[PDB]
């Protein structure tokens, strides 16, 4: 027919139950209370499996000692004895680990594409009729990617631990919320007050759920119109630069002292009537813009609103993009849900669904939308899926209808102002000591805060376990210090640290086990580029080799508090300067090492292979 | 805005019990949840330590709990998990009662001026004006806020890998008896495979409590009355496994070859935590129910005398039988059954089947707002003083019936095998849940100046006599000092022990027939105990009744709760052990302390 999108139900809008078409129809996960209850239980189980509340409580004392041993300046120390800082560290540490792992997988994908750029260029140029999903399969096969599936089922199987979204209610379980002092400036009373968070922070955690996008999701929008390998890589980096900036904003909302809004769906109080209408309000915690979607009958309308600069009277800010008239004053039952996709991903499907509003049934429109928001499940309709990915690229590209850099900058300024206002208000009410406990000024942004990233190692070379940490990219400029903590069963041990650059690596041998040891100090300019031994670099790789290891931690610290920001890179900025990461794969064997091998040595000195012994 | 009808089928409630995959999917996530928090490998490890602590309590002869015997260990695993989950819910109820009392003026305004809105909306409003830790009344939100302890106990996973068939023939050797004690009889194995505990959150109870409440005092009384009934039923559930009988299994009967226009459904609920059962029949658009007693049953019939009637139900219907485990109490199931009967004309047959099955199997409230209001109104009526069911009479009769079964089974086994074999397979010590000497492992998420705070709530007691409380503390460091704080209305008592890896008695209390104790000259219904330990690894609290099978206190009702009011506002305050001095230990009333510093006396 004329329509490219064909509804599973015909023009009669009736599908017989028990038939194949009805079996493959999408389901309303948000609207169905059985479906919503099941999704929440599985999500909580996944979080509790990887992150154990009983384990995090036990490791609190060990982490507190390490943070003090960093010898930070006054006003920049992180005190984990305070309950508020410990809760913020728990959320931040898991947030940064997930972002770190996604960045690591992106670098491997970039290296794989560059190794087979001739075959990749042929696929992108010759084949344009196939969909985005089919193009991703061919690319992920031509390159020897570890994960070769873009299907949601294959992604969940190969997702692995460490990238599981954080579940706020699990983190906030069992923490004291109400403590009174009643005008008692005493050491015992102040110690008691430091043990409890306030109600505002409890409400923030109950409405928090992080979103982390795998590189196998990003590849489909990246290759939808890409014609060359450079365009494909440039699109991949542009999307992840936007994602990382939004992820930073998400953590900053917990630091400032206000309650974050919760996404909800409004549906009519009376079920099974003629009149059918639904209103979705999405408040992405990891973003600066929101979405309001209204479906009355077969008509779909949307409005993109700013999450900043809003008075207390109205939750919605100014409208930055309009797609119709949406009434948010509709009366009905309110069902709260947690979005699992970014604002751009939600917006991309909304534009695609509006185009095919009359070509799909209402149940298909609702089921496809709710499955994406609540499960990150892409629509099974291939034609609908392809249009969504085309809109996702447009929302990210330079021709985007939304100026993302302007809105992200405004969100940062608005959040900083709110922190100052809330700190001054509580200072007058209670005092400086109480205000500092509840609103710590040391945390600020996610990549500005001093944070630790526990490392997991599955590779053992001659009895030495390799722990890999990727240094950079940096969204801030200043001076950065890196430290490593090594816990080993043996009483005396020798461990090695290696930093890989574009031309050569630096080998370090250390012996101190439990106290943190500084490994690398760097200076980064306003372009997010550091000068590592005469060569400009955008990121570095740090590998720790430890024998009979139990735990390895890496601490990131900025010299100054509230480090100034670096403008987010776009597609034009990424294609301008190209850095080679093919050297991040090579390893060394600490067992076969000599005194002459330690230090900074360029590749020319080594042979082919044998990156341990410096004899050519 | 007229729909094409596809959306309304997607929000249509589903037959979870009848559909096999839905019933397969729910068993799997309930098993996963139980194994997530209670690990069989961990529990088998701590068997040796628990056995030593139980032996170190120095119990009198005939009251010792020997965890070396397989039967006693299995019953301890069920009892400790059941008692723990009930303890957190009681702690949460006490916290909620405190918050309501601080905001009585605001709560009173809501109750008077919000009669029009739904029960769920009123509960959400009440939980917002108070600074409640959990502010969600939806089922999805309650699951997220639920902790580790409150997870229901999955019976089949507990009784996995335990040896059942051990045969020693006419042998009285010590070696043979040791092998005999390592196994359990087949009867206990069937008991665990049909056991699933139900623990109701305080947030679910606030909706029945606030549906007709007009004052804050009435709302608190309604909450306490429901949990008095709920806790009583949990005791009966544990005693059912203690006796030598096999508990019945809930089941659903469906036609062998169902027809499109002439289908029928029959539901039989056998709540393990309760004294009454429910039979619900759905023939066409007609709904009928019968409430039957679970006690006094003869061998021929699995149903006792019916105590409440709602029509005629035919339990002799022929068809396929599907077994399931309920997630709601008998009172909760009955409330929906009465509500569904009234709305039978206005509801489709698919809605009748779907709404009922989702509530019993998943504890999911119906999406219909009118149906939700009527159920919570009926829930209040069934738990009030004007309830059609005399719960106190049926709870007491179940207690008497269960005691007679234990004597009959023990005497029957004594004749067949002997006294030694009978004691192994039917332990007489365990008796009721609150009677039994049990331990409650404590979790601590609060640290004050390096000291982790572990909180335990003494009482409320359903039994009277003399009760002893002991605490075991395990720490990594050697030569530590730990403190115990017992908080009451008048003041708190501070104790320093500095002994690890062994039980240490901290309190001895006497409870009278009204379930109240005299703590330093004042009547207390409950007390709060806080243990402060530095670098702690495990803190365990034991409770012990001086005599076996302590007599039961009559279950309190609504009028009993409003007659006497006790203040629990002082349970929140704590001390800083690092700043303690020698003069600070002992019993000290608040008048002595300065405002906000309860560690150091003026």
């Amino acid at each position: 027919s004329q329509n490219s999108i064909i509804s599973l139900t015909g023009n009669d809008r009736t599908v017989a139950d028990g038939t194949f078409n009805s079996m493959i129809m999408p389901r309303a996960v948000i609207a169905n209370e059985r479906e919503h209850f099941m999704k929440t239980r599985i999500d909580k189980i996944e979080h509790d499996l990887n992150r154990s509340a009983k384990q995090e409580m036990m490791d609190r004392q060990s982490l507190a000692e390490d943070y003090n041993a960093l010898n930070l300046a006054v006003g920049q120390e992180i005190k984990l004895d305070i309950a508020t800082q410990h809760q913020l560290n728990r959320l931040g540490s898991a947030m940064y680990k997930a972002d770190h792992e996604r960045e690591t997988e992106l670098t491997d994908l970039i290296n794989r594409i560059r190794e087979n750029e001739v075959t990749v260029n042929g696929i992108l140029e010759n084949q344009k009729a196939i969909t985005a999903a089919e193009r991703a399969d061919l690319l992920l096969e031509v390159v020897a990617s570890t994960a070769k599936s873009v299907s949601a089922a294959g992604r969940a199987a190969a997702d692995g631990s460490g990238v599981v979204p954080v579940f706020g209610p699990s983190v906030a379980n069992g923490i004291k919320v109400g403590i009174d002092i009643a005008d008692s400036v005493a050491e015992a009373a102040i110690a008691v007050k430091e043990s409890g968070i306030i109600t505002q922070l409890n409400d923030v955690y109950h409405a928090f759920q992080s979103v982390h996008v795998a590189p196998n999701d990003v590849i489909k929008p990246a290759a939808v119109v890409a014609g060359t390998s450079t365009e494909l890589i440039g699109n991949l980096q542009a999307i992840y630069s936007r994602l990382r900036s939004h992820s930073d904003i998400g953590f900053k909302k917990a630091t400032v002292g206000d309650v974050i809004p919760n996404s909800y769906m409004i549906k009519p109080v009376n079920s099974t009537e003629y009149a059918s209408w639904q209103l979705y309000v999405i408040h992405p915690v990891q973003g600066s813009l929101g979405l309001v979607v209204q479906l009355m009958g077969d008509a779909l309308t949307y409005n993109v609103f700013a999450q900043y600069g809003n008075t207390s009277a109205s939750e919605f800010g100014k409208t930055v993009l309009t797609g119709g008239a949406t009434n948010t004053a509709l009366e009905g039952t309110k069902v709260k849900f947690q979005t699992k996709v970014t604002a751009q991903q939600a917006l991309a499907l909304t534009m695609a669904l509006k185009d095919a509003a009359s070509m799909l049934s209402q149940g298909e429109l609702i089921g496809y939308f709710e499955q994406y928001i609540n499960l990150a499940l892409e629509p099974d309709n291939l034609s609908l899926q392809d249009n969504m990915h085309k809109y996702h690229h447009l929302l990210t590209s330079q021709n985007s209808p939304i100026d993302w850099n302007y809105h992200d900058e405004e969100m940062h300024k608005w959040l900083d102002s709110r922190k100052t206002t809330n700190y001054d208000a509580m200072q007058k009410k209670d005092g400086t000591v109480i205000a500092d406990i509840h609103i710590p000024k040391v945390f600020n942004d996610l990549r500005n805060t001093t944070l630790h990233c526990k490392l997991e190692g599955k590779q053992t070379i001659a009895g030495y376990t390799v722990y890999e940490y990727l240094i950079g990219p940096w969204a801030h400029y200043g001076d950065i210090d890196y430290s490593v903590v090594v816990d080993t069963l043996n009483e005396e041990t020798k461990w090695y640290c290696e930093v890989i650059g574009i031309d050569g690596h630096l080998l370090i041998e250390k012996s101190v086990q439990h106290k943190p040891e500084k490994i690398l100090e760097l200076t980064v300019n306003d372009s997010g580029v550091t000068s590592f031994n005469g060569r400009n670099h955008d990121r570095l790789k740090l590998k720790v080799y430890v024998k009979d290891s139990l735990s390895v931690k890496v601490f990131r610290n900025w010299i100054g508090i509230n480090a100034p920001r670096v403008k987010t890179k776009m597609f034009n900025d990424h294609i301008g300067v190209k850095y080679d990461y093919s050297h991040f794969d090579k390893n060394i064997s600490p067992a076969h090492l000599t005194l002459t091998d330690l230090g900074w040595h360029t590749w020319d000195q080594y042979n082919a292979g044998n990156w341990t012994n410096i004899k050519p | 805005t007229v729909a094409d009808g596809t959306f309304n089928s997607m929000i249509m409630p589903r037959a979870v019990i009848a559909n096999e995959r839905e019933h397969f999917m729910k068993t799997r996530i309930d098993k996963i949840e139980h194994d997530l928090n209670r690990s069989a490998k961990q529990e088998m490890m701590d068997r040796q330590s628990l056995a030593e602590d139980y032996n170190a309590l120095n119990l009198a002869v005939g009251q010792e709990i020997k965890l070396d015997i397989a039967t006693q260990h299995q019953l301890n695993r069920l009892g400790s998990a059941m008692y723990k989950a009930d303890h957190e819910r009681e702690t949460e109820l006490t916290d909620l009662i405190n918050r309501i009392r601080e905001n009585e003026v605001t709560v009173n305004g809501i109750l008077e001026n919000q009669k029009a809105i739904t029960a769920a909306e009123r509960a959400d409003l009440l939980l917002e004006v108070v600074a409640s830790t959990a502010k969600s009344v939806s089922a999805a939100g309650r699951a997220a806020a639920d902790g580790s302890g409150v997870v229901p106990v999955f019976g089949p996973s507990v009784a996995n890998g335990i040896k059942v068939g051990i045969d020693i023939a006419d042998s009285v050797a010590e070696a043979a008896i040791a092998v005999k004690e390592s196994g359990i009889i087949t009867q206990l194995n069937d008991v665990y495979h049909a056991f699933q505990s139900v623990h109701v959150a305080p947030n679910d109870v606030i909706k029945p409590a606030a549906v007709v409440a007009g004052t804050s005092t009435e709302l608190i009384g309604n909450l306490q009355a429901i949990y008095s009934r709920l806790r009583s039923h949990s005791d009966i559930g544990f005693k059912k496994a203690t006796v030598g009988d096999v508990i019945p299994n809930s089941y659903m009967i469906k036609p062998v070859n169902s027809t499109e226009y002439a289908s029928w459904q029959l539901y039989v609920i056998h709540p393990v935590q309760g004294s009454l059962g429910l039979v619900v029949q759905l023939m066409g658009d007609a709904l009928t129910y019968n409430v039957f007693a679970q006690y006094g049953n003869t061998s021929a019939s699995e149903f006792g005398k019916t105590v409440l009637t709602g029509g005629a139900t035919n339990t002799a219907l022929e068809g396929t039988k599907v077994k399931f485990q309920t997630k709601v109490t008998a009172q909760q199931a009955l409330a929906l059954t009465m509500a569904l009967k009234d709305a039978a004309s206005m509801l489709s047959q698919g809605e009748l089947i779907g709404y009922f099955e989702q509530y019993i199997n998943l504890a999911l409230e119906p999406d219909n707002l009118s149906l939700q209001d009527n159920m919570h109104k009926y829930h209040h009526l069934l738990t009030s003083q004007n309830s059609p069911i005399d719960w106190n009479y049926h709870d007491e009769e179940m207690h008497k019936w269960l005691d007679s079964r234990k004597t009959t089974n023990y005497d029957a086994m004594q004749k067949k095998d002997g006294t030694v074999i009978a004691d192994i397979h039917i332990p007489k010590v365990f008796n009721d849940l609150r009677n039994t000497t049990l331990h409650c492992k404590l979790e601590g998420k609060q640290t004050i100046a390096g000291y982790t705070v572990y909180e335990y709530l003494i009482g409320p007691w359903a039994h009277y006599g003399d009760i002893d409380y002991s605490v075991v503390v395990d720490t990594l460091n050697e030569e530590t000092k730990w403190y115990c704080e017992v908080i009451g209305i008048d003041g708190h008592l501070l104790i320093e022990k500095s002994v690890q890896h062994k039980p240490e008695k901290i309190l001895e209390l006497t409870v009278n027939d009204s379930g109240v104790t005299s703590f330093n000259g004042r009547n207390h219904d409950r007390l709060k105990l806080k243990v402060y330990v530095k670098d702690s690894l495990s803190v365990k609290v034991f409770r012990n009744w001086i005599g076996i099978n302590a007599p039961r206190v009559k279950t309190k009702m609504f009028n009993d709760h409003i007659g006497v009011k006790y203040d629990y506002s002082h349970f929140d305050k704590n001390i800083s052990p690092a700043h303690l001095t020698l003069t600070d230990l002992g019993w000290h009333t608040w008048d002595q302390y300065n405002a906000g510093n309860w560690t150091n006396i003026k």
């Binding site: 490791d59 060990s62 982490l63 816990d487 735990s551 | 990594l476 460091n477 670098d535």
Partner: peptide, 14 residues
């Protein structure tokens, strides 16, 4: 083993 437990155990051993 947690880092807190390992450090405490090592101190006990020495």
């Amino acid at each position: 083993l947690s880092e807190t437990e390992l450090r405490a155990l090592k101190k006990l051993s020495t």
